[PDB]
């Protein structure tokens, strides 16, 4: 999951001088800058709140795939702090499903892929940001 994260963050860093001029830029460049800003806000983390491996995998799968694009940047952190809570209460089984086959060579196996997709869609439908 983190390969696309690293690639997009590197692309944003190459365009890091351009954040304040994002409006007057190419559509693809603006999209890359916006995605990089969202990922950087995602990496922001409070103190004494470590995230388990399944939670990080779920959040990064939601981020690398186009699911946080509609969420504004200042709320991205909040989104994470809600989404995991959702997975912690509404869908406890998807977290265990991610954690069980975290060692699988082809991790996004169809079962976990559908489970995580459904969880993300259900969370986004109910919440407003």
């Amino acid at each position: 999951v983190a390969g696309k994260l690293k690639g997009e963050l590197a692309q944003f860093r190459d365009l890091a001088a351009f954040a304040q001029f994002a409006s007057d830029l190419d559509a693809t460049t603006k999209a890359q800058i916006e995605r990089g800003q969202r990922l950087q806000e995602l990496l922001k983390q409070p103190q004494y709140q470590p995230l388990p491996v399944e939670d990080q995998v779920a959040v990064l799968y939601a981020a690398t795939n186009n699911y946080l694009d509609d969420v504004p940047v200042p709320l991205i952190t909040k989104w994470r702090d809600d989404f995991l809570a959702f997975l912690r209460t509404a869908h406890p089984e998807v977290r265990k499903l991610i954690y069980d086959n975290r060692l699988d060579r082809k991790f996004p196996t169809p079962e976990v892929k559908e489970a995580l997709e459904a969880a993300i869609k259900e969370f986004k439908a109910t919440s407003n940001y």
Binding site: A17, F18, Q20, F21, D24, L25, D26
Partner: protein
Amino acid sequence: PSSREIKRRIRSVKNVAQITRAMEMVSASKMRRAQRNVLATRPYADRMREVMANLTARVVGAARRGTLLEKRETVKSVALLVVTPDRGLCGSLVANVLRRAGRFITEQRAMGRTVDVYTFGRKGRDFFLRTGFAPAGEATRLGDAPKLEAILGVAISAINGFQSGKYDELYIIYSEFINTLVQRPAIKQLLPVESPDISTTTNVDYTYEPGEEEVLNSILPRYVETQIYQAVLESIASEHSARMVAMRNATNNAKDLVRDLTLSFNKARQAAITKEVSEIASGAA
């Protein structure tokens, strides 16, 4: 040269390079959009151009053409529309254009003609408000994509002038755009004499409903306004291209200065380490 002030210099020049690089990117993007705007504006000007050709191929009567199409013999008063970028950093364009305004205001002032000036932009508004040539008309705050409505505030008056006799000609000094790197200044005549090769018009004939005179009198101001709008758009495109080139050169210069400052900082760092170890060994011994 204390191995720490040089670090501050390196940081400052790197910030300069980053700002200049961002400005160069956005100037390139705005130059592209200005070129697109010019291309979109081309069909209207072209169409009205062959309309000028056809109509002038007719109504050749000097008395009929006494309206705008007439050439004032005295040429006692002349007017210059200068379109100057509003913000600097453009490079040598702002100056190259305000210089040709001088070559003209003089060669003309030398003809005894009272040269006056209508200026598009704050850069021009000043060169002349300072020189003393308070712009007979000033259009400032010009955006990358203005609408013809804007040039109207000044073109109406220049035209009402060639009609009030207050002027006997109107030239516009604007910044052409030859290559994405070249932006030669240029002057065009704004008097609507037209009358190109009879071949260009092909003598297309029409039944002018309001009348030949009425159509001509209502179409010449629109033609000169379209010429002014096209000149302003080309000037905006040339401004953006010149700013892009200037920021590319400034970024290259800043990178060279960063390399030189890095060499100096490394020399200072080695000297500082040598001095520290020398004095420590002296104190130990």
